[PDB]
Amino acid sequence: LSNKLTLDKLDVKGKRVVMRVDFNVPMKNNQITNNQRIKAAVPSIKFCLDNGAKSVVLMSHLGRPDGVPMPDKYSLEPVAVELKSLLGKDVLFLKDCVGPEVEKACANPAAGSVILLENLRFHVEEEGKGEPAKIEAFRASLSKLGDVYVNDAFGTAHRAHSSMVGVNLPQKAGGFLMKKELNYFAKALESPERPFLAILGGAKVADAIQLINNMLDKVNEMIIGGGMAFTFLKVLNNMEIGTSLFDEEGAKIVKDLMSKAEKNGVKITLPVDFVTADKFDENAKTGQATVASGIPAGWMGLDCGPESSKKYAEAVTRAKQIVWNGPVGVFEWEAFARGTKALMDEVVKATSRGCITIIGGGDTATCCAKWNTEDKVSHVSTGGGASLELLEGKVLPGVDALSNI
Numbered sequence: 256l257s258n259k260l261t262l263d264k265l266d267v268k269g270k271r272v273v274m275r276v277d278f279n280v281p282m283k284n285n286q287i288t289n290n291q292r293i294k295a296a297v298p299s300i301k302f303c304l305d306n307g308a309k310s311v312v313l314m315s316h317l318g319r320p321d322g323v324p325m326p327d328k329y330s331l332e333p334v335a336v337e338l339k340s341l342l343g344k345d346v347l348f349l350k351d352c353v354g355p356e357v358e359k360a361c362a363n364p365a366a367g368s369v370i371l372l373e374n375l376r377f378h379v380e381e382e383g384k385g386e387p388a389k390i391e392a393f394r395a396s397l398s399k400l401g402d403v404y405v406n407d408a409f410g411t412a413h414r415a416h417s418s419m420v421g422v423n424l425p426q427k428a429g430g431f432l433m434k435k436e437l438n439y440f441a442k443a444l445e446s447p448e449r450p451f452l453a454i455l456g457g458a459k460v461a462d463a464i465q466l467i468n469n470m471l472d473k474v475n476e477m478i479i480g481g482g483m484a485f486t487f488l489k490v491l492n493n494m495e496i497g498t499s500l501f502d503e504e505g506a507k508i509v510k511d512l513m514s515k516a517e518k519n520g521v522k523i524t525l526p527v528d529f530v531t532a533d534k535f536d537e538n539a540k541t542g543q544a545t546v547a548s549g550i551p552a553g554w555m556g557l558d559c560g561p562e563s564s565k566k567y568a569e570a571v572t573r574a575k576q577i578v579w580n581g582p583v584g585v586f587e588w589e590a591f592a593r594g595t596k597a598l599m600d601e602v603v604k605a606t607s608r609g610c611i612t613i614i615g616g617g618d619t620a621t622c623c624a625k626w627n628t629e630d631k632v633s634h635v636s637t638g639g640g641a642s643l644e645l646l647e648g649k650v651l652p653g654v655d656a657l658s659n660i
């Protein structure tokens with residue numbers, strides 16, 4: 256951020272600050288399961304208040320509600336409650352993020368007010384698909400809520416969404432989390448230790464598969480696990496995959512991606528066995544399957560199996576640097592957590608013999624919290640997809656949109 260305004264050089268005295276944060280925290284049974292992303296924004300929030308900000312208005316998305324209000328399922332209200340404990344200060348929750356009523360609440364706040372808006376993605380204009388004049392009007396509303404703008408939303412920095420690139424105020428500054436994360440990755444990606452292994456898993460398959468092409472120019476090995484594997488195995492092995500996650504669009508490029516991995520000398524490790532479930536539920540009936548057996552109709556693969564764990568461990572043993580986004584199964588549910596646990600054990604062991612290990616993402620970082628490995632890997636990042644986009648070599652949109660020095 257040498258070329259961008261950052262919060263350390265932003266005059267906030269007497270100013271209303273509107274701040275984009277990544278408060279897309281994991282939720283299970285309606286409780287926040289990891290406050291990592293909230294805690295990570297506290298240094299920028301506190302700095303603003305300590306240096307005399309009139310207000311700090313916080314805005315984020317939660318989940319993928321796709322432009323419809325879903326306060327029953329994706330409200331940020333619980334985050335407001337959690338932010339209070341972590342700050343040592345109260346925070347006021349608004350039930351929308353734009354327009355007359357919100358604008359009134361943010362126009363002239365009492366000194367030191369902290370305000371959290373509702374889920375930005377309840378509006379189609381944030382993404383904005385799920386309309387140009389409506390997008391403009393949305394951006395104009397958000398811009399009224401502060402006098403200056405800070406973006407500390409590292410985990411969302413890969414998204415060219417309205418709150419991330421479309422706020423129109425004279426000074427748009429990077430926050431301290433944005434700076435911390437970009438600095439770590441700048442150093443870690445400049446001359447990676449090799450072999451450099453990317454571990455790709457998770458559930459955002461369509462997006463993740465689109466990152467592989469450029470990542471194949473940077474890494475020496477790739478594990479393709481979690482929900483992503485099934486698209487590859489269906490195409491390459493003609494494997495029956497039942498109701499497992501599948502990306503029809505990404506399927507069309509699987510063979511080209513494997514061709515490019517061969518050309519670039521990147522070893523691809525896919526799973527060979529699975530823990531299956533008869534429905535997407537913590538208490539599903541479970542089974543086992545191999546690539547050769549296929550997965551039965553009406554069943555889904557929700558974890559890898561033991562032979563896959565062995566292959567993943569072999570890649571980890573070869574690695575001198577690892578970047579991991581996306582668990583290799585539904586680790587939130589114990590029936591489907593063994594694969595991710597075993598891989599975490601390997602990654603912690605690797606760190607202890609000098610591997611540089613980077614784990615990132617809202618859910619993937621929660622694996623570190625669950626198994627108490629946050630200080631047993633090199634870096635746990637608030638960005639997952641955002642971090643993979645840095646690995647590709649891009650300038651993230653949320654950084655590009657900041658004010659130039």
Ligand SMILES: Nc1ncnc2c1ncn2[C@@H]1O[C@H](COP(=O)(O)OP(=O)(O)O)[C@@H](O)[C@H]1O
Nearest residue numbers: 457458459481482557584585616617618619639
């Ligand atoms: N085989 C699978 N099927 C469906 N979901 C999966 C599978 N493997 C992992 N997941 C899920 O992936 C989610 C995390 O993916 P993602 O959101 O892309 O990662 P992150 O939050 O680190 O960016 C977890 O909630 C996990 O349950």
Ligand SMILES: [Cl-]
Nearest residue numbers: 459460461462
């Ligand atoms: Cl996706």
Ligand SMILES: [Mg+2]
Nearest residue numbers: 616617618619
């Ligand atoms: Mg996630």
